[PDB]
Amino acid sequence: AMLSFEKKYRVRGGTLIGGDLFDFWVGPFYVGFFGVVGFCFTLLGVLLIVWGATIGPTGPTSDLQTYNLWRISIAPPDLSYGLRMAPLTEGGLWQIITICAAGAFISWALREVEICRKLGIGFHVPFAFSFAIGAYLVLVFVRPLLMGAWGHGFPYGILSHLDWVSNVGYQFLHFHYNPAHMLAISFFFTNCLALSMHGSLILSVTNPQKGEPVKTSEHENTFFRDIVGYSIGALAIHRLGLFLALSAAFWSAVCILISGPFWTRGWPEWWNWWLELPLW
Amino acid sequence: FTMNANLYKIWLILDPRRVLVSIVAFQIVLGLLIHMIVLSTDLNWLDDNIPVSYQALGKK
Amino acid sequence: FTMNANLYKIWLILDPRRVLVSIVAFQIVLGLLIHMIVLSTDLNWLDDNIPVSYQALGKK
Amino acid sequence: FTMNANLYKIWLILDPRRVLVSIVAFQIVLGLLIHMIVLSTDLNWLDDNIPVSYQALGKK
Amino acid sequence: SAGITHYIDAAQITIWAFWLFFFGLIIYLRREDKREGYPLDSDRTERSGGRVKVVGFPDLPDPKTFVLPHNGGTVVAPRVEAPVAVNATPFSPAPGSPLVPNGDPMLSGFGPAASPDRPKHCDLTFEGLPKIVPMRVAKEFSIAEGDPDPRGMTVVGLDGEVAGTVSDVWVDRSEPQIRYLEVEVAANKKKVLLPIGFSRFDKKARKVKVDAIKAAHFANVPTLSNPDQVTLYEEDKVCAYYAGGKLYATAERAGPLL
Amino acid sequence: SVMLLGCEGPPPGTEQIGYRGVGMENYYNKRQRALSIQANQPVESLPAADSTGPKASEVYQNVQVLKDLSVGEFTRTMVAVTTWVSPKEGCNYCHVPGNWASDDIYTKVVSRRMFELVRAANSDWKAHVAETGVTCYTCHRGNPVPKYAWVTDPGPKYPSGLKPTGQNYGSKTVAYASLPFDPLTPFLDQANEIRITGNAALAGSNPASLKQAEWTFGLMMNISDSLGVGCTFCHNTRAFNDWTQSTPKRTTAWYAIRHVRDINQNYIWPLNDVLPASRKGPYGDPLRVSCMTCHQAVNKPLYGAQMAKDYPGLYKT
Amino acid sequence: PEYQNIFTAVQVRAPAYPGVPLPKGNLPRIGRPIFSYWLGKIGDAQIGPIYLGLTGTLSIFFGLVAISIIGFNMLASVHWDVFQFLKHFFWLGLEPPPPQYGLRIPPLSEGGWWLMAGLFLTLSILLWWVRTYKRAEALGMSQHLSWAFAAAIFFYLVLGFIRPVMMGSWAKAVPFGIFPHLDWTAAFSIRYGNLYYNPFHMLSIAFLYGSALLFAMHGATILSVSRFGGDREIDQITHRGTAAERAALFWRWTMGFNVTMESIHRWAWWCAVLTVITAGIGILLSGTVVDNWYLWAVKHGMAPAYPEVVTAVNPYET
Amino acid sequence: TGLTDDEAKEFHAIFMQSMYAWFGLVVIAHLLAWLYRPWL
């Protein structure tokens, strides 16, 4: 099924790969060659997370085995295995599910790409998506590699991965002092601010007080100029928000990339370079 | 004087208003900068109790 | 006076208003700065309780 | 030296409203700051325990 | 007995309240989501002659009216929109198959070249003067000190060939900026709009590249019913044409790569 | 710049601490690990002494601690205490020349007390000191004054009008963090409460303040830094208070904390009247002990070198 | 190749805009505009004018007072050494009244500046609130911002005033300092048994992540349909264009459903307000209702169990 | 600076007098400070 204005755009071609082979739609989703690779990667990934849930860390009958959603968890192999493939039931499974996750996100990104080629729009979205794909890769590929073992990756479990974050965070004592962490956190917070401001605006002008007509560009600029003496303007606000969120993802990726591989000490200690300048 | 030759032509290349404003800024910064450096090392001239102690001139 | 004659010409190169307001800015800043500096040192005139111990004429 | 035979001309160069508001702000600020500084040193005039005890006895 | 630990704490029930408010929120947002494009297009609808208008869950929200300022109109959502034929034919008769554009792809007005029928009126300033107008109509505007003046650059298409030259610059009277480049076309000296989004500058050369279409295609740029202003209808019409070239302007953008 | 800044290269040395996926792991600089090892080299022992002879308390005049030693063994014990505590100065550091039995010089009233300090340590604190035990070098390192001794410090200046933040400053003593900069006096001298975690999910029976939590956090930063490790060395940060999820090092550290309370309270504060101003902080409190004092940034002083077992004169009875 | 609409490559100027006109009662506007070729490189180059009423003046006033107490206090903690102030600034801070005082108004030297700075800050934030509602009325617009600011104000109030009053202790509000307030955050999680297991803090985290997800997606979209003037979202909302069409379709073909130029702004709006609102609820139950979230998670069976491969004997139990 | 050749001599002269006067008050203040409490 299609939107009431969709058929007129549902053109043939634009692929990267597959050509007419998989050049079709299913419901509202576009398939494409990468939808197929993606679905395959995805399906095997999920079906394996289901098998991991099925078997548990000590076998299907042990008490640690579980199907409870908060607690099902698939973890990496020990560090003793380094960059080698580890036995299936010892984190191998986790490795394969990871390969599937990376492949699925990359297929998804490439399929959004074929969709830009079809619709004839800019490719800003899948490029932006690729930042999340990047962050995910540092958290499973880059860091654990630079760290000589795949086990440095986070486990795939709703709260257990939260625990990973917690103890990794705490090896540096007071993570808040990670300066890249400070950045990324600043962007994540500001991004959340501009978004609330844009959101609020569009909705405040296209739906004004009863007795008033859809508002104008002139209003838009005049309100935020009224409040804070400046208005970045309509186009650009869409530009900024994209900057903030992509950067927030960036600095998360770098703040974790340096926590290990390039810094081992507590993070507050990093700030020493500042108390020791020859100014004080 | 000069550097030699024709160091006037330099102002056909570099904005005189900007070189002036920039230098004024820089000299002001370097000044506070160094003052702050020397006071921060052994060469301090304020916290010495020289030539007469001041906080235990308000003690006895 | 040890200066130029063509020294007024500087006001054909640099906007006078800015320089005037600026001097005040910089001087006020320096003034506050140095004041706080002295106050942080041996030359302090406030933290000692003299000539009538206002913090221990009816306290302590 | 006191005053120029032409230091009125400063208001041909500087806006009376901005200079006025500026002065007001700076002085009000300075009043506050200095008050805070005095309030943070010996010369405190509030917690002296003089001229008559207001916390009768002890606790408070 | 002073220890009967209750299994229910405020934290459970606050998580309960939250999820309930959540579900209602999600549902609601999906309703504002069907103020356009709905009901959907299936052959479920056509087979049944229409007795299956496709709307899904949740359903469609009662229309809302937008009261345009300036004797402009009134818009409603969701609305009933007149169907419009597709200027293309099914690549396969099976459903979900894409369609091939009819005729010359850039002309088709199908695919990356498709576009809707927006009003044949102009967007307006607050005052009510044509928001987008040329610098020739908007006297005040001026290049920003230190920016090559586009006026007089050479517009050049995707293959290299000169396309035309910048005859003017259209600007937003509401949010001051370059929206459209005007192009005196070489092959016929007719004046066409070129969206800024399709234009790249080469300031050191004073060229204005355009990957969209070929120099030649500039001949078919959709036209304006008045050279001193433009309507909403005409903007979509202008841009979609260039956009078509992204998939059409060459016998290779069609993809594959392998 | 806005320089950039503070940085090590990859790959770091790593050790897995907890279960795979739990994140309880450790990272470290290999280079600096090697430098710490060369700086944490132990002094080899002096040949055992045969002896075979009378007890020290029978041939000497003022032997109140190293009594039960044979003469030979006593002499050996004297040579180890000499190189270990004050080798640039030799024998004369703690003795009045020509008179080995005299206590007419303070460094001896102290040395004596420290003979009871090491002994109590090696014989009573094994749940802490295990079979590595301690010796003079542990704190002294060829120095008369442990380099890494501490003092209750007053922090930076405050005018008279306001009282100190108690926390909020740049201090290497709380790992550079801003927590409170003297988490030692209330925990490694006195015995204030460290526990703040509740043992019940719901509230109404845990009075721990947030402030107390910060003090515990500061102290912990201290500890971490002194032994040169992170919390996953002793904890499972999902539960700092959970003993079953902790590492056997938390147990060890627990007994160590009590131990430093005993060194500081019954061996060091008492020596304050016979010690010179040169050995005292701004409150008149004397230089005392912390974990750093001994560990000097390593999980086991001198990488767990076994020095004491070679000097029997260092054990009680 | 194709312009990305990241950097305005060629700008244009026009006489500045004093703005749509306000009704009687809404005071004059002040300041007269300027342009920054560089803001201009990326956005509206116009800088100001600004509006300042009774509200705006009372808010700037309170706010700057509050900024002074915090600052002056920080200079005092380093002995008026502006150098040292500069050196440790990040670590400087103004701590809260001690518990010994409870909710009593404390002496200057023991926390009273914090209560005054907290007081004045709050009054100034809430005055800025009123400001945005006035500035939003003068334009006939709606209070969507004010409903969000009111939400963020909600979190603020929960953090430094509401939870403290409920807990009967000013020492529980957050201290003013960069590193000090970071430490307050960590200690907060620690004191209540790891905040990761607090459901509300998990939701607030899903919503913060979501503000980044939605704004990145939408923002990337609007740029990708910038070519069709999709940035001109108002008219794409009244009079749907091929920008809003290609936009809704990119996502439709990608994730199976989609929204509209008007509705995405609601998903985004609602997602941001939600962050702060789960967030505040999250701090509200800590100490008031739950004292140890990890335990709470165990009581509701949500905390995972791992084989106990490392363990330590409890001295308190010997 | 859109100034004429004469309105920078006038300006410059007045600037010079006001500024040296400033330095004068400055030396006054500095000698009073030196008398009440020598610092060098």
Ligand code: BCL
């Ligand atoms: C534990 C205590 C330490 C700490 C330890 C850490 C550690 C350790 C880390 C962070 C990380 C981050 N922390 Mg932290 N952090 C601390 C406290 C905080 C605080 C706060 C108020 O106190 C905040 C705001 C943050 C916030 C942040 C961000 C700066 C960052 C996470 C964003 C990210 O990863 O993007 C990345 C986004 C992604 C990777 C998602 C990618 C999406 C992929 C491609 C697709 C997913 C598809 C999937 C299938 C979707 C499901 C859909 C189904 C199909 C339906 N932390 C505490 C003090 N923090 C993490 C980080 O840096 O990021 C790398 C990190 O490693």
Ligand code: BCL
């Ligand atoms: C640390 C050891 C000594 C010390 C050794 C030195 C040394 C050595 C030097 C100083 C210098 C100076 N010291 Mg010292 N100084 C000491 C203690 C102090 C104390 C104090 C509280 O005790 C103070 C307040 C000062 C302060 C001063 C300043 C008066 C002066 C720096 C001027 C500058 O930076 O360049 C500002 C730049 C200019 C004025 C350039 C003039 C610009 C021209 C006119 C540009 C033309 C354009 C237009 C006409 C005007 C430009 C715009 C201007 C903004 C007006 N010193 C300590 C005790 N000090 C410097 C000096 O020279 O002093 C004579 C210097 O070299």
Ligand code: BCL
């Ligand atoms: C330290 C380790 C703890 C931690 C402890 C906390 C605590 C404690 C809190 C958070 C809070 C939150 N945490 Mg956390 N957090 C952890 C790790 C993380 C991680 C991660 C990847 O690990 C993430 C993503 C997060 C994410 C977040 C955000 C989702 C959330 C707050 C949103 C926000 O900005 O509110 C901030 C926005 C505001 C406060 C409103 C701002 C508006 C005000 C009024 C602005 C006024 C401006 C002012 C007047 C301007 C003048 C300046 C003056 C000088 C002051 N945390 C770990 C588990 N986290 C909140 C929470 O969850 O509580 C349940 C919170 O308070």
Ligand code: BCL
């Ligand atoms: C450190 C130990 C001594 C000390 C020793 C000194 C010494 C030594 C000096 C001062 C000086 C200053 N001291 Mg003191 N001072 C002490 C204690 C104090 C205390 C106090 C609460 O106890 C106070 C309030 C002051 C206050 C002052 C300032 C009034 C003055 C510097 C003026 C300035 O910065 O302007 C900066 C200047 C300007 C901004 C421009 C000057 C005005 C121009 C010429 C006007 C032109 C018109 C203009 C265009 C428009 C004007 C409007 C502007 C908005 C202003 N001192 C302690 C006790 N003090 C200085 C002084 O006396 O004057 C030289 C000085 O040299």
Ligand SMILES: CC[C@H]1c2cc3[nH]c4c(c3C)C(=O)[C@H](C(=O)OC)c4c3nc(cc4[nH]c(cc(n2)[C@@H]1C)c(C(C)=O)c4C)[C@@H](C)[C@@H]3CCC(=O)OC/C=C(\C)CCC[C@H](C)CCC[C@H](C)CCCC(C)C
């Ligand atoms: C980079 C800046 C921000 C961003 C941007 C971003 N994300 C994006 C996009 C963009 C622009 C898309 O266009 C794309 C999308 O489709 O939009 C929703 C996407 C996306 N954002 C999503 C996730 C996501 N993005 C996140 C964050 C971010 N993305 C940043 C905030 C986050 C977090 C952690 O906050 C998440 C969870 C997806 C819904 C979607 C991409 C969906 C997709 O790629 O699907 C294909 C894959 C599957 C359907 C699953 C594969 C099967 C696997 C083998 C099993 C899962 C393995 C997994 C590793 C286990 C982890 C378990 C966890 C419980 C720990």
Ligand SMILES: CC[C@H]1c2cc3[nH]c4c(c3C)C(=O)[C@H](C(=O)OC)c4c3nc(cc4[nH]c(cc(n2)[C@@H]1C)c(C(C)=O)c4C)[C@@H](C)[C@@H]3CCC(=O)OC/C=C(\C)CCC[C@H](C)CCC[C@H](C)CCCC(C)C
């Ligand atoms: C969805 C929740 C998000 C959110 C929303 C949000 N924030 C908001 C709003 C909203 C809806 C507003 O309406 C309001 C705003 O104005 O938006 C731009 C605001 C706000 N967001 C801001 C901060 C903020 N919000 C944050 C977080 C968040 N807010 C969440 C991400 C954060 C964080 C945690 O990172 C911060 C730091 C502020 C800019 C603003 C509230 C401003 C305010 O309350 O002002 C109080 C007082 C002052 C600023 C004092 C004035 C000081 C002047 C700046 C100096 C000017 C002096 C001048 C020279 C005059 C002369 C002086 C004389 C006295 C001498």
Ligand SMILES: CC(C)=CCC/C(C)=C/CC/C(C)=C\CC/C(C)=C\CC/C(C)=C/CC/C(C)=C/CC/C(C)=C/CC/C(C)=C/CC1=C(C)C(=O)c2ccccc2C1=O
């Ligand atoms: C055996 C075998 C064959 C298996 C059977 C297969 C099975 C199981 C069949 C089931 C099929 C069904 C039920 C579903 C398929 C599941 C698929 C493949 C997975 C879904 C993956 C997917 C990405 C889901 C994510 C869901 C969420 C919430 C994503 C977050 C994004 C977000 C918050 C969503 C809502 C907001 C959206 C969509 C905004 C997009 C959007 C934006 C951003 C604009 O800016 C814009 C501007 C102008 C007009 C329109 C838009 C617009 O639509």
Ligand SMILES: COC1=C(OC)C(=O)C(C/C=C(\C)CC/C=C(\C)CC/C=C(\C)CC/C=C(\C)CC/C=C(\C)CC/C=C(\C)CC/C=C(\C)CCC=C(C)C)=C(C)C1=O
């Ligand atoms: C109708 O639309 C609307 C408007 O138009 C009328 C408005 O005007 C408005 C009003 C909006 C405003 C007035 C906007 C105000 C902006 C705010 C509050 C955001 C605050 C941001 C800052 C203060 C800037 C912080 C950042 C910096 C100072 C620069 C930092 C530089 C750094 C970190 C180094 C650069 C390098 C990196 C970051 C690494 C690499 C970067 C990436 C990978 C990111 C990629 C980005 C892109 C864009 C492709 C609204 C709400 C609106 O909706």
Ligand SMILES: COC(C)(C)C/C=C/C(C)=C/C=C/C(C)=C/C=C/C(C)=C/C=C\C=C(C)\C=C\C=C(C)\C=C\C=C(C)\C=C\CC(C)(C)OC
């Ligand atoms: C030298 O410097 C000069 C310019 C003088 C000034 C410089 C000033 C500077 C640089 C100041 C810097 C300040 C900084 C960096 C501050 C940082 C603050 C941060 C990061 C704070 C973070 C969190 C703080 C919070 C959440 C505080 C919350 C406090 C609240 C909500 C207090 C509420 C109190 C109220 C409402 C009081 C009520 C009083 C009543 C009426 C109840 O009394 C009876």
Ligand code: HEM
């Ligand atoms: C090689 C150098 C040294 C020699 C030859 C030496 C020799 C002796 C002798 C012979 C005695 C017994 C004296 C008596 O009580 O009659 C003695 C006692 C003692 N010496 Fe040493 N000594 C040396 C170095 C040191 C050093 C360096 C210290 C302290 C760091 C020290 C601390 C003591 C103490 C405290 C006593 C009293 C012992 C007790 O009560 O058990 N000696 N020394």
Ligand code: HEM
């Ligand atoms: C920097 C991160 C660290 C944090 C946040 C931290 C936090 C804590 C907290 C909160 C407690 C109290 C739990 C309760 O309230 O019942 C605690 C207790 C304890 N921690 Fe730490 N810790 C850290 C590092 C360390 C390290 C490295 C060690 C050992 C070398 C250690 C050893 C201990 C011991 C033995 C206890 C129990 C002490 C007692 O109960 O008297 N901690 N820690």
Ligand SMILES: [Fe+3]
């Ligand atoms: Fe938008």
Ligand SMILES: [Sr+2]
């Ligand atoms: Sr089972």
Ligand SMILES: [Sr+2]
């Ligand atoms: Sr130094």
Ligand SMILES: [Sr+2]
């Ligand atoms: Sr004095």
Ligand SMILES: [Sr+2]
């Ligand atoms: Sr007094």
